[PDB]
Amino acid sequence: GSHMPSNHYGPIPGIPVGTMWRFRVQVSESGVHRPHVAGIHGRSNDGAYSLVLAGGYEDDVDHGNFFTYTGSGGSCDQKLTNTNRALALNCFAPINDQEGAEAKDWRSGKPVRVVRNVKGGKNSKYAPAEGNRYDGIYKVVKYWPEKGKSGFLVWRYLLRRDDDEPGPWTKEGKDRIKKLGLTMQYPEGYLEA
Numbered sequence: 202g203s204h205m206p207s208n209h210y211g212p213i214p215g216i217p218v219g220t221m222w223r224f225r226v227q228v229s230e231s232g233v234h235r236p237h238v239a240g241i242h243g244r245s246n247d248g249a250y251s252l253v254l255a256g257g258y259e260d261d262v263d264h265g266n267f268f269t270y271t272g273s274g275g276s277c278d279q280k281l282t283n284t285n286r287a288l289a290l291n292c293f294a295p296i297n298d299q300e301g302a303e304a305k306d307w308r309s310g311k312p313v314r315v316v317r318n319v320k321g322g323k324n325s326k327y328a329p330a331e332g333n334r335y336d337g338i339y340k341v342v343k344y345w346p347e348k349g350k351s352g353f354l355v356w357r358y359l360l361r362r363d364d365d366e367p368g369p370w371t372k373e374g375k376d377r378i379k380k381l382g383l384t385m386q387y388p389e390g391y392l393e394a
Contacts, residue, residue, distance in 0.1 A: 207235035207242060208250055211312050216335060218366035219378040221385045223332040225318075228253070233335050234316050240273070243287025248311045249341075252288070253333070254325070255318035259350065260357075263317075263325035265368060267342075271349070272356030279346070285356045288313070292341035292358075301345035301356070308363050312338040315360070327370055332385055337364035 205213065213232045220233075228234045234251040236242045243249030254263060258271040272285040281289055281298035293310035294302035304310055315336050322328040327336070339360040349355035367373035377383075387394045 205232050207232040208244070208247075210248065210250060212314065212338060212366075217377065217381055217383065218335055218337045218364065219369035219374055219381070219383045220335045221329060221332055221383060223385060223387045223391065225253075225333065227386060227388060228316055228333045233314055239284060241284040241288060243284045243290075245283050245286040247287065248290045249284065249288040249313050251314040251316065253316045253318055254328070255320040256323060256325075256328075257320075258355075259324070261324065263321060263327055265327040265370060266362045268325075268339075268360055270358045270360060272358070275353055275355070276351075278354040279349075279356050281356060288341060288358055289344050289356070292344055301343065303343035304341070307340050307342045307361060310340045312340065312363070313360065315339045334369060336369055337362060337366055339363065 216231055216233055222228050229237055234242060234253055241249050241252045261269045261271055272279050274280060289296055291311035291313060292302055293304035293306055316333050317328050317336050318333050319329055319331055340363045342359045342361050344356060344358040346354045346356055
């Protein structure tokens, strides 16, 4: 078709790792992470295409090439429905909503485009100091339920990077950002700009 679909797995053609946008509306317009609100874009019967890392859930850790991530929903126990289900399906293992699942061959799972937002900075040295940054493709290694801070069950996910483009914080990634002349994209008139 004529439309560039975000519901396609993998990188968006023309959007290299290291691309930066001041606002979420711009990330959405690029197609890299379509949802205006949702932290994950995915379909419960298919898989997850993208996610934004923006802090929240204190138990989550972000080590750049790997990170943990907590589901949504549930006040009550979280279920493997909606985007929780979508993300679980990416994992290279049959779906299990009782104990979760782990992929031995996790690189064979479905790709997730990951954008890091400034708001994840308290618990992440990899969050951009401003706006939003596309950091590449990651894969779901394992997921599992556990008791949350609330006392109710939450779904947790461990993702690992699996991308031919180097991480944008790496010397090699910084070199690409310079070569490609990537800079913070501000909307027309904002600064004004």
